[PDB]
Amino acid sequence: GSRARVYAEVNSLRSREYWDYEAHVPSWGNQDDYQLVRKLGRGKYSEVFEAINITNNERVVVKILKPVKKKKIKREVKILENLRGGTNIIKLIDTVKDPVSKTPALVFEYINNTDFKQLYQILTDFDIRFYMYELLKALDYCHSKGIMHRDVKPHNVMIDHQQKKLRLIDWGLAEFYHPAQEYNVRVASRYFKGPELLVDYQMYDYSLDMWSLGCMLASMIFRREPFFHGQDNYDQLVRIAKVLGTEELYGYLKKYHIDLDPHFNDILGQHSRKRWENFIHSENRHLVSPEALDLLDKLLRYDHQQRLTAKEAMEHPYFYPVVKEQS
Ligand SMILES: CC(C)n1c2c(c3c1-c1c(Br)c(Br)c(Br)c(Br)c1C3=O)C(=O)CCC2
Ligand SMILES: [Cl-]
Ligand SMILES: [Cl-]
């Protein structure tokens, strides 16, 4: 069966306590040190506030967890602790509880996030290379720590475009990679789901995140955001196949002995693989280069095992101008 080409055995080479999150016992500090200032948003399992630590005036973000999901809380906490100090991963400052109700919350460093819908229409060529390289550092780091993020998307990539700071947030879907483990395919947001998820292939790996980052790259260089805009999970695969091709999808399915839900037979149609240059027009031509297309072509592949790793992507000539500037 399938396995990651990189960091496949890394959790097995570490102490069991590293990855056995169910056994993790967080130290829960006191939420009363924090003053909530403003609500920033809400997820299925949390609500997020900007806050101030009253003891030292630090501005932070507090994510208050809906507390009936103990295993999932331990997972997110243990993952964040393991990722401590990783480049461009959001910093977990503390794990706290309301001392009376015992409701848990996560305290993060604050980032002054620029709205991505506005930002992605003003990025320059260099900006895209820069931010994509910064995001890749976060993914290479978390992959090297045996963790798949499983929800990479613009809303989870905080960018302070004034300070040029990027942080990958929202680790609540992340999981430890173990070779041959079958994972739930109900992860990632629709537009960023890899084909593997859409065809119910459970033996996926870190390369799922590389598909999602390819989707982000394509939206930035082509200015079509999201790049693959499905109406539902079925239509999402059709949108992919209209670009990557249907015969090419079937070759992937055949390689991995993947069974295709027969509802797809009535909607996939027949589509040639499209040239990436077909997406260029006057509005995006200044963001597209041969090196951007070569990189994108190596990310947005059906075959998860053939996608570039985060490191291989960082190594691509598209990022040479960023490396040189950083030197
Ligand atoms: C997009 C924004 C409104 N946002 C959301 C979430 C989170 C944020 C957010 C921001 Br912004 C910042 Br800044 C930091 Br730091 C951190 Br941590 C978070 C965070 O965890 C969710 O968890 C789900 C709903 C939306
Ligand atoms: Cl899972
Ligand atoms: Cl298209």
Give 138-199 as a DSSP string: HHHHHHHTTEE----SGGGEEEETTTTEEEE---TT-EE--TT----S--S-GGG--HHHHT
Q: Within this chain, do residues 46 and 184 fall inside the same structural domain, yes or no?
A: no
Non-local CB neighbours of 138 within 8 Å, separated by 6+ positions: 86, 87, 88, 89, 166, 167, 168
Any atom of ligand 1 within 6 Å of the Cβ of 40: yes
Q: Within this chain, do residues 24 and 118 fall inside the same structural domain, yes or no?
A: no
Task: Provide the b/e sequence for 115-146 (b: ≥16 CB within 10 Å).
Answer: ebeebbeebebebbbbbbbbbbbbbbbbbebb
Q: Tell me the resolution in Å.
A: 1.0
Structure tokens at 60: 């932070």
Q: How far is the CA of 118 from the centre of ligand 2 (A)?
A: 33
Check whether 325 is labelled as a binding-site residue.
no
Non-local CB neighbours of 42 within 8 Å, separated by 6+ positions: 48
What is the C-alpha separation between 149 and 167, in angstroms, rounded?
13
Terminus-to-terminus CA distance in the chain, angstroms? 41
Q: Is beta strand 147-148 parallel, antiparallel or unpaired with respect to 175-176?
A: antiparallel
What is the C-alpha separation between 116 and 51, in angstroms, rounded?
22
Whether residue 174 contacts residue 79, with contact meaning beta carbons closer than 8 Å, is answered with yes
Any atom of ligand 1 within 6 Å of the Cβ of 61: yes
Q: How far is the CA of 313 from the centre of ligand 2 (A)?
A: 26
Task: Name the nearest CA neighbour of 171 among 139, 149, 152, 155.
Answer: 149
What is the C-alpha separation between 270 and 206, in angstroms, rounded?
30
Domain count, the chain: 2
**Where residue 194 sits, what CATH number does that domain have?**
1.10.510.10
Q: Within this chain, do residues 279 and 226 fall inside the same structural domain, yes or no?
A: yes
Q: Which residue has the tokens 């200015």?
A: 223
Strands (E), 22-100: 29-30, 34-42, 46-53, 59-65, 92-97
What is the C-alpha separation between 95 and 62, in angstroms, rounded?
10
Substitution site in 45, 50, 61 for ligand 1 pocket (most atoms within 8 Å of beta carbon): 61
Q: How far is CA 216 from CA 51, 118, 244, 263, in A?
A: 30, 15, 16, 28
Structure tokens at 169: 């947030």
Range of the structural domain that residue 212 is part of: 1-19+111-327
Among 94, 140, 151, 205, the active-site one is: 151
- Of the residues 110, 138, 154, the one at which a domain ends: 110
122: helix, coil or strand?
Answer: coil
Told to judge if 151 belongs to the known catalytic residues of this protein, a careful annotator would answer yes
Task: Name the nearest CA neighbour of 179 among 153, 212, 139, 146.
Answer: 146
Structure tokens at 293: 């297309």
What is the C-alpha separation between 298 and 129, in angstroms, rounded?
16
Q: Within this chain, do residues 75 and 176 fall inside the same structural domain, yes or no?
A: no
Whether residue 227 contacts residue 215, with contact meaning beta carbons closer than 8 Å, is answered with yes
Q: Within this chain, do residues 125 and 181 fall inside the same structural domain, yes or no?
A: yes
Strands (E), the chain: 29-30, 34-42, 46-53, 59-65, 92-97, 104-109, 147-148, 157-160, 165-168, 175-176
Check whether 60 is labelled as a binding-site residue.
no
Q: Within this chain, do residues 89 and 131 fall inside the same structural domain, yes or no?
A: no
